[PDB]
Amino acid sequence: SLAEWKLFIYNPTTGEFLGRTAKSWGLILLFYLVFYGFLAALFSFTMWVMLQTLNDEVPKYRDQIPSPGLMVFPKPVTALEYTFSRSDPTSYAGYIEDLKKFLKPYTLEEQKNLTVCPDGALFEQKGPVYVACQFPISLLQACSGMNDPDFGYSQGNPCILVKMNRIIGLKPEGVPRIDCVSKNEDIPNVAVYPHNGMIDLKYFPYYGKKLHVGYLQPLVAVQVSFAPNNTGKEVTVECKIDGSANLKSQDDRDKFLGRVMFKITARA
């Protein structure tokens, strides 16, 4: 029941604040300020020296990212599950907003300054100009904004974009493509629109964000059709790469290395 800490702080004798006087506090704080300033200066110098040894165009190591992953767009709110209603425009508004923002560079208006490249041939560019092939949005028919502002939504046929992760200097072998099949036995119709997946080789290799300015990665658009009266919800569709032995898709630890699985739910 004794307040010994009352005299510990603001001690009337000698003016000891927590056992140290005003001068002692000032000296110790000045020492710690100078010490931490010197430490920060040394840390910053060492960081600058390290960054001066790095390449601004290609990362030093690429052995931790040897094969591309497979990802869907847009990213749903939770757990990569697409949930919306046909009748309520505000249920799927975010998906359409994201798709319009993503597909703006792919419209012919923006990519009119790009170059046309022959199909089916790997496009290696040793030169310093590093031109970028153009990906016309017409390949994603019925899943582009040109034909209909609602990307299949408001009709019961949502459109979802599937893209392969960009890797610098990766040259796929064979004929890369992405196939998507419904996991359920009900097998609602899924339509990969550029024929098959058909990841054409002229978009590879990726040369980096710095060098290969204006790059547009190939896109695959999947459309999941539903009946008018029958919702056909809780449909699960899995996509994977099955054209290149260079691009692995059977990894057990990584469920997204070369493949992607997502669920679509439709209402009304």
């Binding site: 931790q64 610098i168 710095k210 290395l257």
Partner: peptide, 17 residues
């Protein structure tokens, strides 16, 4: 669930990588 995280060089990484 975000398996296209981008680094400073434009490459995209899965969660496991």
């Amino acid at each position: 669930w975000i398996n296209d995280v981008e680094d400073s060089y434009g490459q995209q990484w899965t969660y496991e990588q």
